[PDB]
Amino acid sequence: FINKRIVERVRVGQILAVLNRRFVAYKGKMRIMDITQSLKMGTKLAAPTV
Amino acid sequence: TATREVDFTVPDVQKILDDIKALAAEQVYKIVKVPSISFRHIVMQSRDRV
C-alpha cells in the first residue's frame, strides 16, 4: 500500500489534463550571466613610503 | 553567460558615408520617346471581329 498515483489508466482526452504548473521563461534575446567571481576583483592601495 | 551568438565586428564608416553620398545621384524616372504598348489584338478565322 502506497498512497501515490504512480501508474494510472487514462483516456486520450485526459492526456493534456496534467497541465497545471506555472512556468516562467526568459527571452532568448536577453542574456543571463553569473557575476559571483567578479566579487573578488579589486586592487590594494599602497601606503606612501621613503 | 548564456545568449545567442553575435559577432561583434566594427565596420569602416568612410565607405558607408561615401555610399550614402553616391546614393543621391540615382534617378527614379526615365525619359522615353514612345509609351510602352498597352493593348494587343488576336485574330481568329473571322474577318469581322477580333
TrEMBL record, chain A:
Subcellular location, record wording: Virion
Protein name: VP3
Source species of the chain: Bluetongue virus 1 (BTV 1)
Shown part of the complete sequence: 852 to 901 of 901
